[PDB]
C-alpha cells in the first residue's frame, strides 16, 4: 500500500481536501487503501478533517472502512472525534465496526461522549454502539458524560443503563 506514486498523491489530496484530485486519482487506478508509514489512509484523513465528498468517493471505490492506523484509529473514531455527523452516518451505513477500539480502549461512542457530540451519539447508538464498553480506564460513555458535566448527554445514556 506504499511505493505507489499515485498512493502518496492520494494521501496528500485527501489531507488537503482536493475533491477533484481524489476523483481523478481513483479514476486512474490509485490504491484506495494507500497508507503512510503510520498506517494512515486517505479515508482516515478525510474522516478526521470532515471531507464528506472525498469519503463518499473512497466508499464508491470499495475502500476498507475498517482500516486502523498503528494507533488503532479507524475512520469512524476520527469522524466521531471531530464531529462530522454526515461522515459518521455514511460510514455506519457502509458497515463499519461501530465498537472498534483504539489503543486507549475508546470506541467511537467514548470519543463522541468526550466531545459532547449529541447527534453523533444518537446515530452510534442506533447502529448498535455498546453503552457498556469500558475504555482502558474503566469508563463508559455515561461515565465520561457525568465527569464532563454534560447533562444533555447524560440524559440519554442514563436511560440505557
Amino acid at each position: 500500500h506504499h511505493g505507489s506514486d499515485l498512493g502518496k498523491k492520494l494521501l496528500e489530496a485527501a489531507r488537503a481536501g482536493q475533491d477533484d484530485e481524489v476523483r481523478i486519482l481513483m479514476a486512474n487506478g490509485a490504491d484506495v487503501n494507500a497508507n503512510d508509514v503510520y498506517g494512515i489512509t486517505p479515508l482516515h484523513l478525510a474522516a478526521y478533517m470532515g471531507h464528506l465528498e472525498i469519503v463518499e468517493v473512497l466508499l464508491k471505490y470499495g475502500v476498507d472502512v475498517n482500516a486502523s492506523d498503528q494507533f488503532g484509529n479507524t475512520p469512524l473514531h476520527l469522524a466521531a472525534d471531530d464531529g462530522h455527523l454526515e461522515i459518521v452516518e455514511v460510514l455506519l451505513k457502509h458497515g463499519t465496526d461501530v465498537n472498534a477500539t483504539d489503543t486507549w480502549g475508546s470506541t467511537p461512542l467514548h470519543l463522541a461522549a468526550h466531545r459532547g457530540h449529541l447527534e453523533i451519539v444518537e446515530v452510534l447508538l442506533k447502529y448498535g454502539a455498546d453503552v457498556n464498553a469500558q475504555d482502558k480506564f474503566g469508563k463508559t460513555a455515561f461515565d465520561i458524560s457525568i465527569d464532563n458535566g454534560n447533562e444533555d448527554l447524560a440524559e440519554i445514556l442514563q436511560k440505557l443503563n
Binding site: 503510520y38 494507533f71 484509529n73 470519543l111
Partner: peptide, 14 residues
C-alpha cells in the same frame, strides 16, 4: 489549542 482525546493525532496535522 485542540485537546486530543485519542492517540496519534499529531500525525494527522503534518
Amino acid at each position: 489549542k485542540r485537546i486530543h482525546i485519542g492517540p496519534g493525532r499529531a500525525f494527522y496535522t503534518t
